[PDB]
Design a protein around this ligand. Sequence first.
Ligand SMILES: OC[C@H]1O[C@@H](O[C@H]2[C@H](O)[C@@H](O)[C@H](O)O[C@@H]2CO)[C@H](O)[C@@H](O)[C@@H]1O
Length: 304
Amino acid sequence: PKAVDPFEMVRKMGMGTNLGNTLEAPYEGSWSKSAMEYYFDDFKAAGYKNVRIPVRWDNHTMRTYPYTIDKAFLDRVEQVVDWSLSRGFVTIINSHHDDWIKEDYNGNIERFEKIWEQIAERFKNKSENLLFEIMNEPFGNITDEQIDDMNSRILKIIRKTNPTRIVIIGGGYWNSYNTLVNIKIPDDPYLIGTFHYYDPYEFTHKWRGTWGTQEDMDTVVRVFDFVKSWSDRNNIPVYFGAFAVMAYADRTSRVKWYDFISDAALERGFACSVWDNGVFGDNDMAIYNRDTRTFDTEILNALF
Ligand SMILES: OC[C@H]1O[C@@H](O[C@H]2[C@H](O)[C@@H](O)[C@H](O)O[C@@H]2CO)[C@H](O)[C@@H](O)[C@@H]1O
């Protein structure tokens, strides 16, 4: 009845990191290096206060009823979660890249439910610091009615075994042109809303040449301020699961951007996780080198 409320958590979560391109890859390791328990020792030393762990269940779950999840895979995900929880991190697991659910919905919603049914069961006794994020990026390729349907039913499933565990549902998205927020939010006291950058017409834009300008900053504060009003009006805390997910004009801009987002976000009381590709050598968007156990100091400095 009296558990931690979403606002207390968001305050607790603070600035964190993503364990990108790992368990959300088709198969763990097929992309960036697999999860090692030292990753978390370093993140803790680094300052991160939360760790989002994307997870694609597609290939560890039967494609046919009863859509059971590999016993082993579940064991694996729990091992990683426990490493994170043991270190005091507010930990977030979800469904990432399980696009099949958007290529149909009437057809795959049950498989999606079974998966969430089994996740909720296995982690039901986990610490309050383990949050369930229904789906990474709900928007796009699916009607609003279906996005709403999905949240209600997965939440309902989760609540049967996790009566007070905080759940994260998309509250909306933003892009250079507009911001979209949800009006219809489920009637539940344990929900956090999450936003990500999304542009349905992305594969059309005549483009610009990546981010970093003053105009972009002006654009984000705009977005952040509206989400803020949304947050206050709906009484639902905000969390930017993966930011700085863009390419930049140069090293100096990139650092500045990481410094900027963190400031604006936390000042408005938002929780957020930086997107960490876990890739160096391309070099993309990785802050922590899983091979050298070293971080891009300048960026960490800009985040804290
Ligand atoms: O889809 C494969 C592609 O994913 C990239 O990460 C995404 C992340 O999955 C998404 O949730 C977030 O909103 O954006 C990031 C980056 O765009 C990953 O960085 C790529 O290497 C990978 O090929």
